[model samples]
Target: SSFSFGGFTFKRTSGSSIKREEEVLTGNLQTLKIRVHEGYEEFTMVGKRATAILRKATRRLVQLIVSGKDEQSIAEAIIVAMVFSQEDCMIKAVRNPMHQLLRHFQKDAKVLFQNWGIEHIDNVMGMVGVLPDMTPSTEMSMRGIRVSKM
Candidate 1:
C-alpha cells in the first residue's frame, strides 16, 4: 500500500509473515531542500511527524497574515523557519500558497495606497514643491490627476 502527499510518497513494505508490519517505508520519499542567503540544507520527516510539521507551519503563516505583519517578509521568514526545522513536507505544504498570498497582499496594498492619495510619497512631494510655479498649462495638467476620489 502506498500514498503520496506534497510530492512525497509513502509505502508499506511487505513482511514475510501473512500479516503486514505497522511501519511504513518512506524509501520512495524525497528529502526537502531549500536555500537561504547563507547556504542550502535538506530535511527529512516521515509519518505523523511530517503531517504535524506541515500543519504547524501553515497555522503560523495564517496567524502572521491575520496579524497584519508584512506579508512578503512573513512568508519568507516562515519558509526559512520550516527549512531550519528540517521538515521538507512542511516547506512544500506552505511555499506556493504563501507566495500566492504575498502577491495578493502586495496588489491590494498598492490599490489601497492609491485610493488613499498616497501611492508614492516622493511623487506627491514633488507635485507639492512645484505647486506655486504652476502656469495655465500646468494647472490644466493637474485637472487630469485625481488625488483621491474618496
Candidate 2:
C-alpha cells in the first residue's frame, strides 16, 4: 500500500531518516592572501563515487520540474539549474524549467506517468527534491533562500 504524509506508494522502506541543515563557521580563513598560495584547489570536490548519486539526483530534478499547484515545482527546478550549471555537470531534463518554472503546468503532455497524472504527484515530487537540499545531513548544512513548501 502507501504510507501517510505524502502518500507515496512504494515497496521499499520509503521514509526513515532525519536531515538537519544549519549554518556553521567551522574554520577561520577570514583574511589575508589576496595573492593566493602555492597550492591547488580541487577542480571538483566530488568524483567517481559521486557519479551514480549525482545522476540520480539530477534526473529527479527534471522529473520535479516535470507540476501543478503553487508552482513550487519551479522552486525545485530552480535549484536543479544551479547545480548543473556552475558545478560543471551535464544533465538534460525532459523539458526546460522556463515555463514550468516561470509559470504553471498547462499542456497535458507534461503529465507524470508512473505516479499518477497531472496535479497529483507533481507538487509532492517537487517538494521531494527540495526538502533534501533544505535539510542536509549533520555534516552538510549552511544558509540559503528556498521555497520548499507549496
Candidate 3:
C-alpha cells in the first residue's frame, strides 16, 4: 500500500524489522515517562540542544495528555510554557519546530476525521482569546472543521 506525491514515492514496507522498530520506539518513550514520573532524580543534565529537547518534550507531553491527566486548556498551557521557557527561536525561524509539531498532530486528526466523517473537534479553547492557527482557506474546506491553536 503506497502512493506517490510530487516527484517522491512512498512505499509501505511491512516486515518484522518495522514492527521491531515500533516496539523499540514505544519502549524508549515508556522508559522516559517512568523517569519523568520518578522526579528525574537520576536524570543527567545536558547542555541545550534545541531540536533534541523539543522532540523529547513534545513526545512526553503528548503521552501525558493522551493518557488523560489534564484538560485541553491545561495541556495547551503546559505546551506553551515549555516552548516559552526553552526560548528556542526554532519556532520563529524559517522551519519552525512548533509548526512542524502541529502539522504532525493535524495529520493524525485528519485520518480520524475521514474515518468518522466528522468535521472538527469540540474545541472549547475558543472561549478564551486563543484560536486555531490554521483556518479554512476556501480552497481546502472542511464544513465545520478548523485547526486548533498550539
Candidate 4:
C-alpha cells in the first residue's frame, strides 16, 4: 500500500517471516495465549535502524533495553520495545509516545537512551555501549525489521 501524506510517501510492505499463533487460555473467553517464535536473545528492536544492532549487542537474557521509532507517520503505530531480561514489566507498543506518556515513563522512560553517543566523529563508538560524546544525531538507514538471531 502506497499513500502520500503531506510531507512523505511510504510504500507499505507485508512482513511474512514471523508467524504468530494465538491459543485459548483454558476456560477464559477473552483471554488467550499468544505464541510467537521469532528467536532468542537480549535487547531487541524491530522498527528501524537499531534493529541493525541485533547481531551486535550482548548475549543471552541480558539486562538492557534499547529502541528506535516506527513507520510512515507519527501515528502509524510505533512497533518497538525495550525489554530488560530481568524486568518482567515491559510497555509493549504504547504507540508513538509523548511527554504525557514519556513523563509517565519518567515519573514513569524516554530518557531510556543516554548510552548511544559519539565520543568520536567516526560514528563507531555510538554502536558500542559506552559513555561517549554525543554527536549530531541522524536518522535510521536500516529500516527493515532487524530480527535478532538465536
Clashes of 1: 0
List pairs with backbone clashes in candidate 4.
104-108, 105-108, 105-109, 106-109, 119-133
Q: What residue runs in model 3 are displaced by over 4 Å at the alpha carbon? A: 1-70, 87-95, 102-150
Q: What's the lDDT for candidate 4?
A: 0.26
Question: Which of 3 and 4 is the better model by TM-score?
Answer: 4
Residues 61-133, candidate 3: write the lDDT tens digits.
Answer: 1111111122343333323322322222212221243344344333333332232222333334422211133
Off by over 4 Å in 1: 1-28, 31-69, 91-150
Local distance difference test, each candidate: 0.25, 0.23, 0.24, 0.26
In candidate 4, what are the lDDT values of residues 53-99, reduced to their tens digit? 22212111222223334222111111122222111122231221222
Write down the lDDT that model 1 would get: 0.25
The all-Cα superposition gives candidate 4 an RMSD in Å to the true structure of 12.0
Candidate ordering by lDDT (highest first):
4, 1, 3, 2
Report the lDDT tens digits of candidate 1 across residue range 65-148.
Answer: 011123333223333333333232333333133344334333433322222121112333222211111221222222112111
Supply the TM-score for candidate 2: 0.17
Summarize candidate 2's per-residue lDDT along 57-95 as a digit string, tens digits: 211222222122333334233343333222111112123
